[model samples]
Target: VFPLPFKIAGLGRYVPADVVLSSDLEKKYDLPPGWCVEKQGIRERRWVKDETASFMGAEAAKEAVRDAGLKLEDIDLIINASGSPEQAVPDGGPLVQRELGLGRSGVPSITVNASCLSFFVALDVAANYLNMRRYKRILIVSSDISSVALDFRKPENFTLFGDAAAAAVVTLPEPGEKSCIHASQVRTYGYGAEFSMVPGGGSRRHPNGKNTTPEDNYLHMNGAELLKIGFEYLPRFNEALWKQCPDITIKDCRYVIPHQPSRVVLDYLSLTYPDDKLVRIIDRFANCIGASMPMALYEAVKVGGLRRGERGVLTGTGSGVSFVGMVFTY
Candidate 1:
C-alpha cells in the first residue's frame, strides 16, 4: 500500500535466436515425441548460443530506451534483476553498464537478486527510489541463462526454462496522473526453502568443494512438494493482499502477470483469476526465471493487450518459497 508514484514508461525483451523445440528435449531424453510438450506445456524456448547475460540485458535496454523515446544516457540508475548471475563475482549490473557503452557515464548500478521474483522486487525498489526522487529515470533489467545448468534427467525442470532478458524504463508519473503502485506485499516461508533450489555455484556447494556433486550444479526442484506448500499459503496470501486494497480485485485488473514457472502453477492460478485476465508466455518462452514476468508484460504491452492507464497486477513466487504481489495502474 505504498502508493508510490511511478510509471513503466517503456519495455523491451531480448529472446535468443536459437529456438529449441520441446521435441528436441524429448529426443535427447529418449522420451516419447510429445512427452515434453504434454508434460511441461512448452512448445519451444529460446537458448543463447553466443549471447552473454550482459549482452542480452543491454540489447533489451536499448529497445526500452528507444521505446521510451530516450537515450542511454537518460537512464540515471541501472538495476540488474536476474535470478541467475553471469558469474559469481562482479554482478551483472556493472557488466550491463559496460555493455551499454556507458562504462564511464558514472551512472550508479546495482542488483536485486530474489531468484524468480527478482524483477517484481526490483520494480518495488525502483518505485521507492522514484518516490523519494533519488533518480529521475531507472532502468530495471532481468537477464537469466537457465539452460546451461539444467539436469536433463529431470524433465520437469529441464523443459521448463529458457534464456532471455527483459528491460523496462520507470519514472515518476506525470504531474497528477493515476499511474502508480496501488498495493504491494511479499511473504517468505522458510519451511519450504528447499522446495526449489540450485545448490551449487555458491560457497556451500562450490565446484571445488569435495562433497559437491555434478547434480548439485543444476536446478533441483520438487514440483509437487513446492505446490503443496504453495497451495497451502497462496490462498492466505491472496486474502492478505485483497485486504490491503478494497478498491480492486483480480476481476478489475486489465491483466495479471504471473511468473511463468510451469503449466501446473499457471493452471492452479486460473482457479483464482479467470484465464482471460492472465497473461501467459510459458508456451513459447518457457520459464525465463526472473525475466519471464516482464517478458510477458512486454509482449502484452507491445501488442496492446494491456493498454495505458489500465490496471494490472504483478504476482509471483521464487526459490525462497517467497510470494509477491504488486497492483498498479499501467
Candidate 2:
C-alpha cells in the first residue's frame, strides 16, 4: 500500500488507419464466417502500414502533452512502455524522443517492459518519481505492433492482436487535489511463462542464430494452459491486492479498466463489476498488447466514464503470467 502523490494529468491514444475487420480476417484465413467475431469478440482492429512503435508513441505523446496543457519542453522525462520494441537495440525511449522532435532537448528517457502491464508498471515508476520530485511532468507511452510477428495460419493469436498506442502525462497533484495512488500490486509466476511467448528474436533463439525457423519468430500461445493458470491465480491475486488497501474495494470503484487480452477474459471479469463500471474496447480495438490498458483508460477518460476524485482500478495479466492491479483516484 504505497500511497503516492501523483495524478494522470492527461491521456491520449492513437489508432492506425488500416481497419482489419473480423469478417475480412475470416475470408483471409479461410475460416468459417463469424469465427473471429464469435471466438474473439473483435469486430475490427487497427493495423499499421508504415508506422513504427516510436512514431505512434510520439503521436500519442503529443496529444497527451496537449491535453495536459503542457508543452513538449515541460516533459522532463519520457518513458516508453511498449510491449514490443521498434527494434531490439537503443531502446524505444530515445526513438520516441527523437520522433517528438526533442532529440537535442536531452530530456531524460527510459523504457519499461512487463509485457501487457508495461504501462501499469511505468505508472508506478512515474508516481514514485513524482513523490520524490525527480521530475515535474513525465510522459508515458505504450505502443505495440503485434501484427508483425503474427502468423495468419494461427488465427487464434493473429486475430486476437492489433496495433495501437496510448499515452499519459503524470505529475504531482495540484494543491488540495485528491488524486493519488492508494494501492498497487504486481506478482509474477514464471512457471507459466512458456505458455504464451514468442520463442525467437532473443539470445535463446535469435533470428540470425543456427536452428532458427520462420515459425520460431511467430507468436505461440498455449491457450488452454494460460487460461487454466489465470482461472486459478486471478481470484487469489485480487484478494491479496484488496487486502493491501482495505479502505477501498472493487465495489466502490467508479470504473475498472482491464487489459483487453480477449473477450473470454473480459466476460469473466464482468462477473465482478457491471457493464457500466467496466470499460470495454476489445470489440473495436481488440488486444493491442501493452497498449490495451492505457488505451482503454484513454477511452474511459475521453468518454467521461472516469472522472476526477473517482476511484478506478487498472488490473490485468501479461505474458510473464504476471498479474498487476492498481487502485487509484482519478
Candidate 3:
C-alpha cells in the first residue's frame, strides 16, 4: 500500500452548544412519533442557533491549529471541504479564512466538495500538495448546516442530520516515519446522482425560476432508494478495495470511522471488523453531512483508547454514490 507523504498532525471537532433531543423533535418541528430514535437511533443532535457555517468551520480549524501546536498564520493553505457552501458567490474557503482573521493573510484558499465524501477528497488534495512541496502545512475544514434545510415531514431524512464541523492539520511526516501518514481516496458512482439532493439552492433552481417548487429548497433523500443501491453495490465496493489494498482490510484496522449512515450499514460493517472498533456518532451527532467522519475520527483519537501504530480505516458514502476509504495509523 502507498503511504501518504504527509501526516494528519492534529484533529478537532466542534458543534453547537444547544442540544436537539429526539423527544423535542415534534415540539421543534412537529416530527413523527418516535420516528428518529426508534428507527435511526438518533438520540440527540446539535443545532446552530446563530452561527454561520464559516464560523463553525473556523472554530474547528482554530482547535486543530492549537492542537498541532501552531498559530493560525502558520497554516499555509486553507481547504474548505464542505459538502455545501456557506454562500454562493465567494466560496466557503474565504468565509472561513476571514473568520480565522486570515482574510488578508495571503494564504491560498481552495475548496473540495463531494457531498458526504468531501473530507477524504480534500485530504487527498492536501496530500498531493504536500507531496509536491507546494505547501508545508495545510488546514482542512468541513462544516455542514443540515438542520436549516431539512424537510421535517420526512422523518428519516430530517432526523438523520445535524450541524457540526471538523478540521485537520496536515503536514509533512516525521523523518522516516511513514506510519504517521494517512491514506485515502474516493470512487464516484454518478449513476445515482438523484438519490439524495438539495435541488433549489444550486444553479439548477433560481430563487424565482421556472419549474421550481418552494419545497425544492429543502433536502430530498430517497432512503429506500439509497438503501437498495448501497446494499447492492457496497459489498462489491468494499471487496474490490480490499483486494487492491490487503493491508486496509477490516481485520487490519484498529478502528473503522465511517459516515453517519444507518444501523444496518454499521451493523454489517461491525460484523466484519468486530469488537468496538467501529467508531460512530450518528446517535450523538446524527449525520453531520461531510463533518461526520472527521468528527468521529477526532473523538477516536482524543478518547477512543486507540494506541500508537494502531491503524484504522476512514470511509464514507455520499450522494454521488461515492465510496471513499483510506488507511492511517495513530
Candidate 4:
C-alpha cells in the first residue's frame, strides 16, 4: 500500500448558548408550524448570545489540543477560518491566539476566509505546511456566527442559519496511524458572487457616508439561484474528484458530507450520490455557515458513522462562488 501524507490527530466542536427551535421560529416569524421542517429539516440551531467567532474557536481549540494529548504550547501553528470575524481591525486568529495563550507562547497564527469553504481551504493550507516539514502539528479552527450576519427578521435567511465552531488537530502521520489525506480540488465561478453577500461594510461599498440598515449587515441568499448552482456544479465536481481515485465509485464512499444548507440540498445530494449514506445533522444544528461541514464530520466520526479504512468525501460550496471537494480515507 502507498503512504498517506498526514493524519487527523484530534477533533472537537463548540456550539453557542442559545438554541433556536423550528417551532420557535414559526411562532417568531408567523410562519406555518411545518414550514422549516418540511423545507429545511432544521429543527433547532445554536445561537450565540455574547460570543464572537474567536471565542468559539478558542473553546474548540482548547478541547482539540487536550484531546490530542498535547498542551497548547505544542501547537506550532494556528489557522483560524471564518466568514464572520469579531472585529475588522484585528483578525480572529490573533484574537484566539492571544486568548488561548498561544501568542505569549510564541506560536504562529493566521486567518483564512473563503466564505463557507474557509475550513477546507484551511485544511489544504495546513496540509501544505505539513508537507513542507515546517510544522509538526497545526490547529485548524472554523467558526461562523452567520446568525449575527443574517437578518433574523427575514424568514428566508433566518430559518437557514445557525452559529457554531469546530476544530481539528492535524499532525504528521505516525507509523501505522489509520488515516490518509488524498486528492483535493477547489473550483470557483465569480459570477455567482452576487447571489449571496453582504453588500456594505467592505472597501467596494465603503467611502460613502451612509448609515446602512440593519438588514445591510445581514446575509442575503437567493435560495433558488443557489440550488440551481448546486444541482449543476456539485455532481460535476464530485464526478471529477471520484475519477482521481480511478478505483473508487460513489458506492465505495462511506459517507458523503456536504454543507448542511438545508433538507433540500441534502435531498439533492442523496439523489446525486445514492449509493453513499447521506450523513446530515441539519435537523439538530441547522446550517452553521463555514463551520457546518467540519462539525458534521466531527459528529459523524464520534457516532461511528466513519471508521478506519472507510472512504469519505468533504464537499463545500460557499457564497464567494467557491466549491471545494476533498477525499479522505480513515
Model 1 lDDT tens row, 266-305? 7776887777777888888898888988997897788646
- Give me the candidate number with maximum TM-score: 2
Q: lDDT per prediction?
A: 0.86, 0.88, 0.81, 0.80
Local accuracy of candidate 3 as per-residue lDDT tens digits, 1-330: 366556778887789999988888856777676778778878889989999999999999999999889999899999999877787878888889999999999998888888778888888888888888999999999999988767668676677778999999998877865554444556776777788877787667877668688788765777788778777887787777666565455666788888775666576776776648888788889878889888888878887976667887888778877888777776
Cα shift from native, residue 50, model 3 (Å): 1.1
Q: Which residue runs of candidate 3 sit more than 4 Å off their true CA positions?
A: 26-35, 151-154, 180-183
lDDT of 3: 0.81
Best by lDDT: 2
Candidate 2 C-alpha lDDT tens digits along 57-88: 99999999999999999999999999888887
- Checking candidate 4 for backbone clashes, the offending pairs are 308-330, 309-330
Stretches off by above 4 angstroms in model 1 are 24-29, 151-154, 207-214
Better of 2 and 4 by TM-score: 2
> What does the lDDT read for residue 43 in candidate 1?
91
lDDT of 2: 0.88
Clashes in each model (backbone N, CA, C under 3 Å)? 0, 0, 0, 2
